[PDB]
Automatic annotation (TrEMBL), chain A:
Functional note: Sigma factors are initiation factors that promote the attachment of RNA polymerase to specific initiation sites and are then released.
Gene that this polypeptide is encoded by: rpoN
Signal peptide positions (record): none
Name under which the protein is recorded: RNA polymerase sigma-54 factor
Family named by the database record: Belongs to the sigma-54 factor family.
Length: 51, 1341, 653
């Protein structure tokens, strides 16, 4: 069977954005937000400095 | 007189008018009889392994003077037991080892053997051994291999004509089906031409197969055709005409009969003329020349002077050629008859069609048919044609094949060769031509005389032969290459191929499948099923309309009722009660021999062929005392046309009325009052029942339930037992009396019950004991009660008080109204067992261990986990709690100042492990029954794994020490008895053993020797006990072997109690089902004149439409039974004397016509009547036969003894208004059974879950929180409404549109309710898949 | 897609690719080394075969996988067939808010409602529950709302009842043949795990309350909710879209209850009683009279719409029964009293509902059907309607008819033995004699079950209709018929058909006096044949419907008028014995052309473009016109689809 199971999963970072979508904010706030939660580890602290 | 101590507790009243002659057989012999002879050591090789060996076992090298034979094979003892195999998970089997013999000889000497290597046997695979119930333990689960039903090997002259001919002409082909190899067919064309066909491939000429078998034209013309003399000398043109041989043709002109003309010119031929011509001797009579033109010449004639090819074979004679052939060649020319009226050539028309006339040119045509290219070279064609059909080790059909071949051709001999022959094909084609001209009738595939069954034995034999013929090639190869060696016979004998083939056959096959463990009847009816699909017969369920029909030969061999109503209808059948297997492959049936009127008690088994000749009477026929008939005319069957015959014309009679019914439909009471479809669906739904906590015996039965229960092997019976000593909830011990006890044993039998074990159907198989303490149990008496059983009787359901009346529409069409009393009484409550399993799967980064050290979790979750991580036995768990705490190691890292600080602060984690603990799936709630852990060899972690090991060791010690204790007690009693009257009292031996004072000196001659012998025997017994305990302990904790990747396996079995509620699919035995829709309280339910409310309300508007009068009969009989039981209970509560109660029981047992003679006060004592009345105090057990049940008059008479209305009606009041109902409702007691189709598993909801990576569609049918599927008929219906927006929502919102789902979720949470379609991902996937080929495709603007 | 985890083992998609890649690499590496012609030609042939197998495997050669003889699915294989890419993507893709709901009976819960279980609920509307929690200030964060919903608090259930109140849902049976396979209802929370479907709607869904599963669908957008409310509601699909008859028609217990409550044996308690009509229930519930009371006089206040757009009252004093007087309270104003004064079977109430729909409207006939169903559910349980063995009566003359038929068969066999009658003639004569005997037995059974019963009265001989449960069910039309009763009291008839032939000796018995083994073994061939026919024709009917929908999908309405006088001629189908279908419904929902002329010269009956709604057909029948030229399909010149001036309505509108 072509796709067998192929169950797309959660992934944490993926989980972080699902609530980003239903948080209310502006385009600039949603842009920085994608930036921030883009740069976040499996452990969960962020990789890059805030500056 | 019937004692039946196990049945004496409760006797069921039978209503059988006819007297039973033959007893019910084991009912499971077809599954064990073949498997026994398959591994049975027989002195002659006919069947089994002795016949699969001798076939191709002698191995001969390629002129190497080295041979290999075998002496005999021996089946090794099994390693584990059935329970052990079920606990472990391994497949129960037995090793096979056969003593072989390799004999090497020197050259230059004829068969002079120099050395033999017959000193070592080799192990070649393990054979899966069967159990005592005809089942296997393959991979721990119980599987069954259903027997197949195919066509018997032989020749079948089918018609195959009608509308399929498309020419308005009848065809007559001929097919010969062997058991192995290629198939041959002789098809008939509308042009009166035959055609040879092999492997249903391109047709071939008719006489090419004859010319290939070294046959010439003259020989074929002389054999298939008859040649007349036709002696025309001196231009007389006279022919020898025989009226008895050839006649029926009008004479043209110039016809005489020995002088005076008998048949005038232009006169029609009459029988008187033929008689007059046959009376007088008729010599050669002159005939005109016109008869020579159309007539053909038989043989090829040549001139006396020269040898030209004039007047060739199969050529019409000419007028100009006649003069020269009469002048030069000869006078008498052999010719033919060619009578189109009663005969037809069908070959001479095809002889000219054959392009080849030589044997060499004809031998290459079949090869060109087989192989398209690579023409032969006078060496490949002959070899291929000889190996195709005339080979011994390549065709080898069967002995049944030769039997049918000889029977379909009127041959007396039945012992022939597996190979074919020339004369065989010749007579087959001759019979085909005769049938075309008309000489007999065609065969019948649906007839049970042309089809045979195959059990598991011959299938395993064939599989083993196929697996061994492959290793034989390797053995020959290894013996041909490097023969100069004296090694042991393990050159090419490899056990992997044969074992793998037999395991593939057993485990994964179309006929082998899991057995339904939901009901004991389901098991025994699955062990008797017969299927047509599989390796042979019907490749699929399609292409058949008349094959699935009920053939008239299905009287007492298969059942025309028990069969699924799905697409595979008619291809799945069941065996009858008395139906057995014929000698070779067919099904037989028993009858009684009728000799000059009287009926002898002897039994004779007949097949489908024998039954069609003799006259077989019907089971519903009157009988006298000596064996004669009452009425002179009796309805009987002769050849398929049932009619009346006198007492001097009948030859056989049936045995009983259950002969035409299978084991399933035989339990249906009053089966002659229900329709065929309803009885069919009831028998099919009976197999879907589920056992409950308290089993209740049925009040309206047939008596067959006892046999079905004792034969199914679902309970525990007492073998060779005399009395019971100790009783326990899971252990039974029986001290056998000295009568049935042989020396060399302690004299005790032990039975360990099965308490709460997971079945295949996730049900619960629990056994309850019957005896209480010190009860004399005989042989063949039951001890325990399996699932849905009661005192050895099959009881799957409860006797619920029902009534037939509509109740506020709650019983609209097929809904059942269940009162609250049934729910409160825990009736129909079901138990289910769930199994969870987890492995370790050692990885590269490190091994995984269960230490309950899970990070990122609360203490509340780990509050139910023990040290090693498993849950305590007896706890509960709901939702997604953790059961087994497993962790997965993570790869090491660098210094990592952040992780270094995190480890210095917290520690013990260091992000080394990940939470991978076994948690319960969502929507699951229950309680854990028991855990289990299996650890491979080499690993000895064993955190808390020694607990189950010590438990099993103590369980083994407890039941092993009993025999040794009994033996020691016997020996000590013998010691104490041998010292009597010798000056030593029993007090000294009772205080301390002291080995009988160590030969104190009672006699000093024989007493000392006796004491020494007794002490030696005691020491030997102690040593044997120690050795047995050591062996048992070594076998217990030896450890198992798991997968290479798997490190250890932890399993957990939990229990779930499911109660009744709306949605469940309740059903009966008369093809009546129902979905619960309401739980009505006790107050709202209607009550009777005594205040007792009904339990179940049913809809009476289904009886006149489904023909279910059987339901009303069962209700009346159950009401009578319940009235008798209530009167008995009142008598018991009044504490009356035993005499009146015994008289009432005796008067209630002998009521009705002469069916059975039983009476109390003569066999039952003053103590057994008490327990008898106490057992049947809630309903009178009644057993009505299938077609010999009780009559309406008897049912009405039975209602008078229990003070009940004979009409069966009774007034009822309303439980809500307190008003009396008009039209009194008939109440009764129906036996109801719960089906597996419950509402707790059907329901499934979803709003948003996980999607797939391909086509981005959700999972589906409840697989990890899936969703339903939309259909094409559904979008058609939607377009019928004109709902474009709803359709677009179903296409983008609830679909694979990724950029739309999140936006819709956001709009719904925010309350916008706006849709953005975009574009589905599946269209893009289709575009990419189309672009993957050489076809451009894109979308414009 | 790794199976064991250690090895991914890409199958059916990467094996052929790997094959082709390595073969092309070897060929390109060997073509530069000056290889001989045979080797390079064989390598090119192998590469051609490999690419062909990658494109189409079934056409040329066969490529299998490890340990499996089954072939692999190439690129085209996942396009065509029942497992391709043109497969279930056209609304065949899996859904989210749906799955496996069990059906039960909705005695309450009237037409525009459905019982959605609260366990299956609160999950489908979870995105709405989150929204309502965020709006009412009960959850400042999404996580908080999720935690409050997973705990199932009381406010969660309150919000659920508040949101699902004014929000419709739709149900869909898994086997759906016609338009009525998917309907819309209002969800109501029931403390169970099975959806309650309305009984009257069960006719449309074709359910039978056995083990079945129903699909549910929730609309999110406002447009989907409006399309479900205005088009897909059960309160709008009264008439059928195929023929015109009303779909909602009672056949179950309701009909039997109405037939029982509207009857009179001879005269029940309180014969001479006279009342006004509202007193009937008063005297029935406590004491005074029964429903079967006859000769009861009452003043009925009918309302007749003789005036244009207005009805007028009329008081009368006709004679009737208590049950009919009680039923008249449920009957609306418009309908007269003559319709409710009869035996009141199934066709009677069907005609009643049809007239209520026609005259009054949609809402009136809906509420009428609801009240009728309520009264039927009440009276079918208040009456009891029991069954029993002595209910059905076997005619005593059967024992004589069977003996006479056996004597006739014996005479036929004697004549055959004498040599006068052949085999086929005797066979046909025996068949005819047994058929006549079965007919006479059926007639005697009907006579013994028909209106033949003596009740005490002055004349002492009052033969009125009997109250046998089976006879009442057959006469009213609830369930069953005379043919099924013939197999319960009389004989089974011939009941002989192995493949095509009929056995001489028929079965002479019923399910009351038992049966024999031979007769029971013979009487299953027809049942097996019927079962096999159904099981092998369901798929054929599905395939036929698929072909029909595929071939007739492009048609749509886009033009108003085609302005063409071309049309088809319509005449009553007068062929055979009598007329099979007159000119009454074949021209009912059509649009006649200008070719309509009166039988008299220079006279017209109707202009060119008119619709014979309900009365023009009567005018045409009065003039005895036989042929009518009517505008229809295709011939209407629109060049796209079919214009709407030649189709009529043929719907529930």
């Amino acid at each position: 069977l072509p796709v067998y199971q192929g169950e797309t999963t959660q992934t944490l970072q993926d989980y972080l954005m699902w609530q980003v979508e239903l948080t209310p904010f502006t385009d600039t706030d949603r842009a920085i937000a994608t930036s921030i939660v883009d740069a976040v580890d499996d452990t969960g602290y962020l990789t890059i400095q805030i500056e | 007189m019937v004692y039946s101590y196990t049945e004496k507790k409760r006797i069921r009243k039978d209503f059988g008018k006819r007297p039973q002659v033959l007893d019910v057989p084991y009912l499971l012999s077809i599954q064990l009889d073949s498997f026994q002879k398959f591994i049975e050591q027989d002195p002659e090789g006919q069947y089994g392994l002795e016949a699969a060996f001798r076939s191709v076992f002698p191995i001969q090298s390629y002129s190497g003077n080295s041979e290999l034979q075998y002496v005999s094979y021996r089946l090794g003892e099994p390693v584990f037991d059935v329970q052990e195999c079920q606990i472990r998970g391994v497949t129960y089997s037995a090793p096979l080892r056969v003593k072989l013999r390799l004999v090497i000889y020197e050259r230059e000497a004829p068969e002079g053997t120099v050395k033999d290597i017959k000193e070592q046997e080799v192990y070649m695979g393990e054979i899966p051994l069967m159990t005592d119930n005809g089942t296997f333990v393959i991979n721990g689960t119980e599987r069954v291999i259903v027997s197949q039903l195919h066509r018997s090997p032989g020749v079948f002259f089918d018609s195959d004509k009608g509308k399929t001919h498309s020419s308005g002409k009848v065809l007559y082909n001929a097919r010969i089906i062997p058991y192995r190899g290629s198939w041959l067919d002789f098809e008939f064309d509308p042009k009166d031409n035959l055609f040879v066909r092999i492997d249903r491939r391109r047709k071939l000429p008719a006489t090419i197969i004859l010319r290939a078998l070294n046959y010439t034209t003259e020989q074929i013309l002389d054999l298939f055709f008859e040649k007349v003399i036709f002696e025309i000398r001196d231009n007389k043109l006279q022919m020898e005409l025989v009226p008895e041989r050839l006649r029926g043709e009008t004479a043209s002109f110039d016809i005489e009969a020995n002088g005076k003309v008998y048949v005038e010119k232009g006169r029609r031929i009459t029988a008187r003329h033929i008689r007059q011509l046959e009376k007088d001797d008729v010599k050669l009579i002159e005939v005109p020349v016109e008869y020579i033109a159309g007539k053909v010449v038989a043989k090829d004639y040549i001139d006396e002077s020269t040898g030209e090819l004039i007047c060739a074979a199969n050529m019409e004679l000419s007028l100009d050629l006649l003069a020269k052939l009469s002048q030069s060649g000869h006078k008498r020319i052999e010719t033919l008859f060619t009578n189109d009226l009663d005969h037809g050539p069908y070959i001479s028309e095809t002889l000219r069609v054959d392009p080849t006339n030589d044997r060499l040119s004809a031998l290459v045509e079949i090869y060109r048919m087989m192989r398209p290219g690579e023409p032969p070279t006078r060496e490949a064609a002959e070899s291929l044609f000889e190996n195709l059909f005339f080979s011994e080790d390549r065709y080898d059909l069967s002995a049944v094949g030769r039997m049918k071949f000889n029977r379909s051709l009127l041959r007396e001999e039945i012992e022939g060769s597996g190979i074919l022959s020339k004369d065989d094909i010749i007579d087959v084609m001759k019979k085909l031509i005769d049938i075309r001209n008309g000489k007999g009738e065609v065969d019948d595939i649906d007839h049970l005389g042309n089809r045979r069954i195959r059990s598991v034995g011959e299938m395993a034999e064939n599989q083993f032969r196929v697996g061994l013929v492959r290793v034989e090639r390797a053995v020959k190869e290894r013996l041909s290459l490097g023969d100069l060696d004296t090694l042991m016979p393990q050159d090419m004998i490899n056990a992997k191929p044969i074992s793998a083939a037999v395991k593939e056959f057993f485990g994964s096959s179309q006929l082998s499948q899991f057995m339904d463990q939901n009901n004991p009847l389901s098991e025994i009816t699955h062990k008797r099923r017969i299927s047509a699909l599989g390796p042979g017969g019907l490749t699929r369920e399609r292409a058949g309309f008349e094959v699935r029909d009920v053939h008239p030969t299905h009287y007492g061999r298969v059942c025309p009722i028990e069969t699924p109503e799905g697409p595979n209808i008619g291809l799945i059948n069941s065996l009858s009660v008395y139906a057995q297997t014929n000698e070779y492959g067919f099904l037989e049936t028993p009858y009684r021999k009728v000799t000059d009127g009287v009926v002898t008690d002897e039994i004779h088994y007949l097949s489908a062929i024998e039954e069609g000749n003799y006259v077989i009477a019907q089971a519903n026929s009157n009988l006298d005392e000596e064996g004669h008939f009452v009425e002179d005319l009796v309805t009987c069957r002769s050849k398929g046309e049932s009619s009346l015959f006198s007492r001097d014309q009948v030859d056989y009679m049936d045995v009983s009325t259950q002969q035409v019914v299978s084991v399933g439909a035989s339990l249906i009471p009053f089966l002659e009052h229900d329709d065929a479809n309803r009885a069919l669906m009831g028998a099919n739904m009976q197999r879907q029942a589920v056992p409950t906590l308290r089993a209740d015996k049925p009040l309206v039965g047939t008596g067959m339930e006892r046999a079905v229960a004792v034969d199914s092997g679902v309970t525990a019976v007492a073998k060779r037992g005399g009395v019971v000593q100790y009783v326990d909830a899971s252990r039974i011990v029986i001290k056998v009396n000295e009568d049935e006890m042989y020396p060399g044993e302690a004299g005790i039998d032990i039975y360990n019950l099965t308490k709460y074990t997971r079945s295949n159907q996730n049900t619960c198989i629990n056994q309850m004991p019957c005896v209480s303490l010190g009860e004399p149990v005989e042989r063949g008496d039951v001890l325990a009660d399996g699932p849905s059983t009661d005192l050895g009787e099959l009881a799957l359901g409860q006797n619920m008080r029902v009534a037939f009346m509509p109740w506020n529409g709650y019983n609209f069409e097929d809904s059942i109204l269940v009162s609250e009393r049934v729910v409160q009484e825990d009736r129909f409550t079901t138990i289910h067992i769930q199994e969870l399993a987890c492995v370790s799967r050692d990885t590269k980064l490190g091994p995984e261990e269960i230490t309950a050290d899970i990070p990122n979790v609360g203490e509340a979750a780990l509050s139910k986990l023990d040290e090693s991580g498993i849950v305590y036995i007896g706890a509960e768990v709901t939702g997604g709690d953790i059961l087994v705490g497993k962790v997965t190691p993570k790869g090491e890292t660098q210094l990592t100042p952040e992780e270094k600080l995190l480890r210095a602060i917290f520690g013990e984690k260091a992000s080394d492990v990940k939470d991978s603990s076994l948690r319960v799936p969502n929507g699951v709630s229950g309680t854990v029954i028991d855990v289990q852990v299996f650890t491979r060899d080499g690993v000895e972690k064993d955190k808390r794994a020694l607990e189950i090991e010590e438990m099993q060791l103590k369980q083994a010690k407890k039941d092993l020490s009993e025999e040794l204790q009994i033996l020691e007690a016997g020996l000590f009693s013998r010691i104490r008895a041998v010292l009597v009257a010798g000056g030593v009292e029993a007090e000294k031996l009772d205080k301390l053993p002291r080995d009988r004072w160590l030969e104190l000196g009672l006699t000093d001659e024989e007493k000392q020797n006796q004491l020494e012998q007794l002490a030696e025997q005691y020491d030997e017994l102690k040593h044997e006990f120690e050795k047995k305990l050591e062996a048992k302990r070594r076998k217990i904790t030896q450890g198992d072997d798991l997968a290479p990747g798997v490190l250890k396996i932890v399993k957990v079995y939990l229990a779930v109690k499911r109660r009744i509620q709306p949605g469940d699919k309740m059903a009966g035995r008369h093809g009546n089902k129902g979905v619960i829709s309401k739980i009505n309280p006790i107050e709202d339910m209607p009550y009777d004149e005594n205040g007792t409310p009904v339990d179940i309300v049913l809809n009476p508007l289904g009886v006149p439409s489904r023909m279910n009068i059987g339901q009303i009969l069962e209700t009346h009989l159950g009401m009578a039974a319940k009235g008798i039981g209530d009167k008995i209970n009142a008598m018991l509560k009044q504490q009356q004397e035993v005499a009146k109660l015994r008289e009432f029981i005796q008067r209630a047992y002998d009521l009705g016509a002469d069916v059975r003679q039983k009476v109390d006060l003569s066999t039952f004592s003053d103590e057994e009547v008490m327990r008898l009345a106490e057992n049947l105090r809630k309903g009178m057990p009644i057993a009505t036969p299938v077609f010999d049940g009780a009559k309406e008059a008897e049912i009405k008479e039975l209602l008078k003894l229990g003070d009940l209305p004979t009409s069966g009606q009774i007034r009822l009041y309303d439980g809500r208004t307190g008003e009396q109902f008009e039209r009194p409702v008939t109440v009764g007691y129906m036996y109801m059974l719960k089906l597996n189709h419950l509402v707790d598993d059907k329901m499934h909801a979803r709003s948003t879950g996980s999607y797939s990576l391909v086509t981005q569609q959700p999972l589906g049918g409840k697989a990890q929180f899936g969703g339903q599927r939309f259909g094409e008929m559904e979008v058609w219906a939607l377009e019928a409404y004109g709902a474009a927006y709803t359709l677009q929502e179903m296409l983008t919102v609830k679909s694979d549109d990724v950029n739309g789902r999140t936006k819709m979720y956001k709009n719904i949470v925010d309350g916008n309710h706006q849709m953005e379609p975009g574009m589905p991902e599946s269209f893009n996937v289709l575009l990419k898949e189309i672009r993957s080929l050489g076809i451009n495709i894109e979308l414009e603007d | 897609v790794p199976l064991d985890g250690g090895r991914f083992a890409t199958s059916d998609l990467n094996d052929l690719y790997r094959r082709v890649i390595n073969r092309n690499n070897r060929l390109k590496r060997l073509l530069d080394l000056a290889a001989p012609d045979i080797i390079v030609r064989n390598e090119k042939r192998m590469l051609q075969e490999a690419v062909d197998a990658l494109l189409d495997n079934g056409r040329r050669g066969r490529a299998i996988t490890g340990s499996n003889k089954r072939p692999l699915k190439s690129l085209a294989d996942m396009i065509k067939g029942k497992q391709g890419r043109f497969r279930q993507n056209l609304l065949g893709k899996r859904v989210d808010y749906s799955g496996r709901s069990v059906i039960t009976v909705g005695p309450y819960l009237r037409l525009h409602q459905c019982g959605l279980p609260k366990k299956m609920a609160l999950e489908l509307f979870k995105p709405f529950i989150y929204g309502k929690l965020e709006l009412r200030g009960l959850a400042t964060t999404i996580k908080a709302a999720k935690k409050m919903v997973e705990r199932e608090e009381a406010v969660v259930w309150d919000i659920l009842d508040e949101v699902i109140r004014e929000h419709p849902v739709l149900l869909n049976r898994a086997p759906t043949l016609h338009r009525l396979g998917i309907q819309a209802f209002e969800p109501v929370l029931i403390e169970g795990k099975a959806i309650q479907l309305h009984p009257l709607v069960c006719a449309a869904y074709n359910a039978d309350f056995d083990g079945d599963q129903m699909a549910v669908h929730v609309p999110l957008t406002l447009e989907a909710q409006l399309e479900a409310r205005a088009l897909m509601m059960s309160t709008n699909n009264i008439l059928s879209p195929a023929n015109g008859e009303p779909i909602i028609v009672p056949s179950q217990d309701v009909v039997l209850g109405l037939y029982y409550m509207t009857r009179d044996c001879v005269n029940a308690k309180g014969e001479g009683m006279v009342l006004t009509g509202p007193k009937e229930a008063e005297r029935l519930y406590r004491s005074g009279l029964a429903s079967l009371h006859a000769r009861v006089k009452v003043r009925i206040t009918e309302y007749e719409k003789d005036a244009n757009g207005e009805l007028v009252a009329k008081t009368s004093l006709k004679d009737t029964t208590v049950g009919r007087a009680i039923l008249w309270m449920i009957v609306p104003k418009g309908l007269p009293y003559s319709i409710v004064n009869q035996a009141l079977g199934k066709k009677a109430i069907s005609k009643m509902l049809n007239t209520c729909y026609r005259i009054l409207g949609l809402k009136p006939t809906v509420i009428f059907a609801d009240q009728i169903m309520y009264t039927g559910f009440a009276y079918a349980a208040r009456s009891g309607a029991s069954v029993g063995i002595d209910d059905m009566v076997i005619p005593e003359k059967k024992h004589e008819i069977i003996s006479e038929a056996e004597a006739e068969v014996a005479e036929i066999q004697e004549q055959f033995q004498s040599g006068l009658v052949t085999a086929g003639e005797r066979y046909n004569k025996v068949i005819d004699i047994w058929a006549a005997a079965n007919d006479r037995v059926s007639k005697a059974m009907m006579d013994n079950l028909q209106t033949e019963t003596v009740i005490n009265r002055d004349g002492q001989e009052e033969k009125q209709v009997s109250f046998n449960s089976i006879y009442m069910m057959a006469d009213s039309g609830a369930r069953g018929s005379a043919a099924q009763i013939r197999q319960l009291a009389g004989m089974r008839g011939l009941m002989a058909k192995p493949d095509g032939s009929i056995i001489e000796t028929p079965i002479t018995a019923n399910f009351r006096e038992g049966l024999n083994v031979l007769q029971y073994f013979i009487s299953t061939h027809g049942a097996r044949k019927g079962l096999a026919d159904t099981a092998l024709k369901t798929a054929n009917s599905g395939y036929l419907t698929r072909r029909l929908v595929d071939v007739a999908q492009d048609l749509v309405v886009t033009e108003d008028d085609c302005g063409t006088h071309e049309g088809i001629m319509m005449t009553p189908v007068i062929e055979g014995g009598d007329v099979k279908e007159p000119l009454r419904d074949r021209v009912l929902g059509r649009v006649t052309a200008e070719d309509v002329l009166k039988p008299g010269t220079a006279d017209i009956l109707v202009p060119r473009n008119t619709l014979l709604h309900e009365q023009w057909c009567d005018l045409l029948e009065e003039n005895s016109v036989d042929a009518v030229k009517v505008r229809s399909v295709v011939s209407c010149d629109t060049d796209f689809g079919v214009c709407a001036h030649c189709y009529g309505r043929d719907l529930a509108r």
